[PDB]
């Protein structure tokens, strides 16, 4: 079975790296220098490095040449055991379902639990249930 290798990357750029790699593979697949990579895993919970699937280290070493994003993680290629070939794909509870409880960060109701009512298909705004905390305009000027 193929092996899974690890390569360092910048913090906050994981989907961009994935799409760039996809574009490079699609653009350099009918040439004399194809990429032997099988697949790359970019979990959402992790942020700071990405994974890559390949048999040998030379494959990914020669496959990440020229890219300016993976330059940092180019002089070291770590190998993980075979037991770690299934925990990377695990996800602990996406996270968008009506009639569920969610919390807020900005606004005035900071660090408070709420409840979802309706979701707009436009993916721009979503309703929310919460009890008001204002003073009803009696204390403020």
């Amino acid at each position: 079975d193929p092996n899974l290798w690890t390569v360092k990357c910048k913090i906050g750029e994981e989907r961009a790296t994935a799409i760039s790699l996809m574009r490079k593979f699609i653009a350099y697949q009918f040439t004399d220098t194809p990429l032997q990579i099988k697949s790359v895993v970019a979990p959402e919970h992790v942020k700071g490095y990405i994974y890559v699937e390949a048999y040998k280290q030379t494959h990914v070493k020669q496959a990440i040449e020229g890219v300016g994003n993976l330059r940092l993680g180019y002089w070291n290629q770590q190998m993980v055991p075979i037991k770690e070939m299934t925990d990377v794909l695990k996800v602990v509870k996406a996270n968008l379902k009506p009639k569920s409880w969610v919390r807020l960060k900005r606004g005035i109701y900071k660090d408070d639990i709420a409840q979802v009512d309706y979701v707009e298909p436009s993916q721009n705004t979503i309703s929310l249930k919460m009890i008001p905390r204002i003073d009803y305009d009696r204390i403020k000027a």
């Binding site: 193929p2 895993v41 699937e53 509870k93 996406a94 996270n95 379902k97």
Partner: protein
């Protein structure tokens, strides 16, 4: 191919049968490639929001399903190369899942993730 690769990161959905992650424009224009005759997705937007759901996490660069352990684990070996996911939360209504079994299409839950 260049038609399955996502164009813009914003506004991206994912299927529930084969977990095909692409951009909304491609879904409206191209639609599900691995399952089109049995899904009837091209040429409308309502069905896209009906079956596909944006509630999904995880991205994988599938390029050789025939020779890959991840494809075997996810049961996506008989699909075309593309950008898939590893956990798509959702379930089709009780009006479209019925005809899949009648036409010889086994409906399986791709939400490999655990709950609590």
């Amino acid at each position: 191919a260049l038609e399955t690769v996502p164009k813009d990161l914003r506004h991206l959905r994912a299927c529930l049968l084969c977990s095909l992650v692409k951009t909304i424009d491609q879904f409206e224009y191209d639609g599900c490639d691995n399952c089109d005759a049995y899904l009837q997705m091209k040429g409308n937007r309502e069905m896209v929001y009906d079956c596909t759901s944006s509630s999904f996490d995880g991205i994988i660069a599938m390029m050789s399903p025939e020779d890959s352990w991840v494809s075997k684990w996810q049961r996506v070996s008989n699909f075309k190369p593309g950008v898939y996911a590893v956990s798509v939360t959702g379930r089709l209504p009780q009006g479209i899942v019925r005809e899949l079994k009648s036409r010889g299409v086994a409906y399986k839950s791709r939400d490999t993730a655990i709950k609590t």
